[PDB]
């Protein structure tokens, strides 16, 4: 009946090597489903079920058939980041130490496709289609030394990937997953009509990367947190991408990063970063809608990462655009920084920066900037919650919109006062937000 359970397969042992088990199942599917056109069918695929459990993967799973679903019964997330920064003598008193759910422990050596627990690859025609990953946990266990000289467990470096799709694909789904302690959670090349929906992708170096090219895809309703040298959501050479209803929290280098992305929408997300450069439209990213997002940029409050950042200064912008004919409408920006820590020394922080391109429409954006002392404490979630709720601050001067001379013929409306909008009025259409009074 094309239904498998990894705990009820005679070949191998999913505790020891679930990779071998799953590959054996896939070989069985292929052996049974050899003919493509028998009574209007023949290759319907299969479902592989992972009950809740701790499964070591020592052999990469190769998925090269369409319509394979791999499903579990728990996303299994717990903060290994918190646990590895608890003093080791206290570990025996903790209720648990590791992630759980339907848990795939990635025990591969470092790559980068070779370090992927699941590799989806098939060449030829048609494109591999409608593979589904649902409601299981992929755990890379540890981060290791890399010459950054953070403590090993804080480097976000292990060469491991959760799911890597190498080949052109159509109608794929990744839903309800948990990813933790992977250098790369989810990397999908050459995607068409993909949906990445309602996952929990956190404490990974990079979370979601859509590479090569793609079209007509969506990234929706995810909880996402990356590492300071990595991407939270990245896409390149995608057209018609929809990124919406995500809650992106620290500490990726950025929240959303586009290279050559066109005719797409980044709308209605909540985005929180500890560094500038939250949303980056780069390399001729054009005709995109960036609307009704909530941006917060503030200072890392947790001691283990307090001095760690992404190398970008406060002139970068929270939103940076290099490309034509984009639409930036109805966003909220909260810039909550220690004025003494602003870089370069004596700079006015920038919120929206247009570095290149023409015809960008920036309207009806509210910028709120305040000066607060940067505080540091060891207790992660208490420090995080307190910092979000603290509104004890002085108003801070900011540049709401900076139009560099290399970007022209833009339209900037109701997104700051005249002093807050730094731009050449002769070659841009600028309407300052109305001033208080008569």
């Amino acid at each position: 009946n094309n239904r498998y359970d990894v705990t009820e397969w005679p070949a191998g042992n999913p505790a020891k090597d679930i990779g071998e088990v799953i590959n054996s199942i896939i070989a069985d599917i292929k052996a049974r489903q050899g003919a493509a056109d028998v009574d209007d069918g023949g290759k319907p695929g299969a479902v592989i079920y992972l009950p809740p459990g701790d499964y070591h993967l020592r052999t990469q799973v190769l998925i090269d058939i369409s319509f394979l679903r791999i499903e579990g019964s728990g996303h299994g997330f717990t903060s290994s980041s918190i646990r590895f920064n608890v003093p080791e003598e206290e570990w025996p008193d903790l209720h648990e130490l590791w992630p759980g759910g339907s848990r795939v422990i990635v025990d591969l050596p470092a790559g980068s496709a070779a370090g992927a627990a699941f590799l989806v690859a098939r060449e030829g025609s048609p494109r591999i289609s409608s593979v589904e990953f649902s409601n299981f946990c992929i755990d890379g266990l540890h981060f290791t030394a890399d010459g950054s000289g953070r403590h090993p467990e804080n480097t976000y470096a292990n060469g491991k990937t959760g799911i890597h799709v190498a080949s052109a694909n159509d109608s794929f789904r990744v839903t309800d997953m948990g990813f933790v302690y992977l250098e790369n959670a989810l990397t999908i090349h050459k995607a068409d009509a993909l949906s990445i929906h309602h996952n929990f992708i956190a404490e990974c170096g990079s979370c979601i990367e859509l590479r090569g090219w793609g079209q007509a895809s969506k990234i929706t309703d995810n909880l996402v947190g990356a590492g300071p040298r990595g991407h939270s959501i990245y896409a390149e050479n995608h057209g018609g991408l929809l990124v919406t209803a995500n809650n992106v929290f620290p500490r990726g280098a950025s929240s959303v990063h586009f290279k050559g992305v066109t005719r797409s929408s980044v709308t209605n997300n909540r985005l929180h970063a500890f560094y500038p450069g939250m949303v980056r439209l780069e390399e001729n990213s054009s005709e995109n809608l960036v609307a009704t997002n909530h941006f917060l940029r503030d200072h890392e409050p947790w001691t283990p990462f307090f001095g760690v950042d992404n190398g970008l200064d406060d002139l970068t912008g929270l939103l940076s655009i290099s490309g034509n004919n984009n639409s930036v409408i109805g966003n909220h920006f909260s810039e909550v920084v220690d004025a003494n820590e602003i870089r370069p020394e004596g700079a006015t922080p920038v919120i929206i920066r247009l570095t290149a391109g023409t015809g960008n429409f920036v309207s009806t954006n509210h910028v709120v900037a305040m000066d607060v002392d940067a505080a540091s404490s060891d207790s992660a979630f208490e420090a995080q919650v307190d910092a979000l709720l603290a509104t004890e601050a002085a108003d801070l001067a900011v540049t709401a919109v900076l139009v560099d001379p290399g970007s022209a013929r833009n339209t900037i409306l109701d997104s700051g006062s005249d002093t807050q909008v730094v731009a050449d009025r002769a070659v841009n259409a600028i309407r300052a937000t109305p001033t208080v009074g008569f």
Copy 2:
């Protein structure tokens, strides 16, 4: 063994008579088997408990004190007990069915200490926080509402002291998805939530639906269908930062649609909100730096006879959206105010749509207010009354105050959200641009 249980395949007790006893027995088994936290990089992966479709009485509270527990069913099972209990009792035997169904947990607990009346209590102290508990695709039914001295018929009081799911302890990465809740005084109450997702549920005919209490961070409430009772909350949060509330369809008859106390740096964006009373969206007690964008607000009069004279106590000067806090952003919303002028309270008042009661720096831009003077048509048949009222747009104009800025609020910016007559505010101390008119 494989950590998968089915409540109809347990040796002891009877899930039809007391599923609580059965689930607790299962949890005891899980704990007995999963005693070690660090055996081969695992040891406490949790489990899944499956409820097939069926009618299960719960007489003992379920206590969940382990991480990575999933409780799942095969049907949200909603039917309108409210409609049924307002059908004359002598006609009940002729109806196709009476009760909710699906994978149905009937809450037969006495009133609580409201935690004591919860069918499912999630509580664990110490470290780490309990994490990644999942509730999926089952039905929780409080069966009846009871007399409370309100003067309403007993089944219309929204009172029984029962909760569906109560999370007492700090928690991380919890999920509540695909549920049905019905006839509970409180459907879902979660304290101290971090990175919680309440997604794609059906939460209706409950006194209060979703309450996020204590504090919280980085959570989301998405894609829900929600309807509460006139003394209760539809969506409530307190001391949350970075909450995302989006893509919900909130229908009557909660006291409010969305109610925030001390909520900061959050987004209430792209929801459909329908109320029968003023005070639909309330930002209270220093709720600051929030985005309230591209929501559709409808306020009209209750059309269903059993509740025609029942309300939330608030008059038409309250506002549909009321803000007490700093630096919020109210952008791109639609407000339909559809009321009978003779029913306006107090007598002869001009209804207010957006009210800023306190705070500075609020940015209110590009909001369309539509106000109509209609009749008060009522009907004994619920879905007929409701559908006919939504489709009726036959009406003369009603004068309203689109934006009221109280003297306790100043330094706000109000743009294209009403004509000068429609914006009641001190022009000396706020920045005001009237919507252009002809």
Copy 3:
């Protein structure tokens, strides 16, 4: 069985390969025989779940669903592009890895009727309304399109008289989730819906995808991937109030992306919409008080030879967004109009983006229009040229009319949605603020 769980491959004497319709009807009869009493121990008709493992199932008898709380579920949406495959020369088929859709696949082998041609018919009259039926994560495939006198190749006609799911009766709290629909004249037709959720489906290569007929209220269509055919609807609703349409990625080639007739107090917000024809979003027949916000619209030319000269009959004066109704709100949308200037229809016309044909009090604000001139080009490549065309931004400017107000619409407000030249409207009876120019 006593626990209300059925698997179509385990049904005694049934053969779901030959006729899964007969199997499912037999299962429904079994459920009804066991669940005859509505009110025993506060229950009695909880419904059931029917599971379809991955496999190829022919349906030769229509399934009639006339019970509440029935869930039909599978383990794969199973989509592959039959459109691409049927346009690959037949001599190349042997080298293709697969030829057909898969997953949990229901092949609709019914003759043309339109409810008679539906694989699943949901019908029950009387009281209460049938409630909380759920369809989840399976595939419905109409197999072939057939000759219809249009002169297209048979497999390109989008004509076969088959429906996936047809709900004929008033319904409450229904769900359609995670499905795949392919090669059906009508995917999903739901009459008289209340509090329906159509969420996270893949609905493509169907003549029409989603149609909500009769009337309805308080429903939502969210997070779907949708592509229809040139004579049909992508998303259609009539006489609905309080409908939320959001987070959908609608791609070609429906006659429209979203079509409303008599729809009121609803929201079409935060979708990505791509069409090869004008008339992408149509608000018709007194569609009033709707919010159309922060959508991304792209209109360009079909690149794929088999459909290059096929269209929806509408000229470039139609508008991308057309409104006939009162008091709507069109806020924060992005429109990309990418067409061949030499081939605009009618000859000599200037394309229109937003058209108000009738009605009063429409508020159109803060919309960005981007128009460019690109030559139309045909080729047989079935995804490469589609990706390439989305990514290409290589063009001359094209003059368009951003907002056209016909004399039959008046008392509208048009702000920052075009230059004075781009807004064609009677200034005596409409309030116009031109986008500031440089």
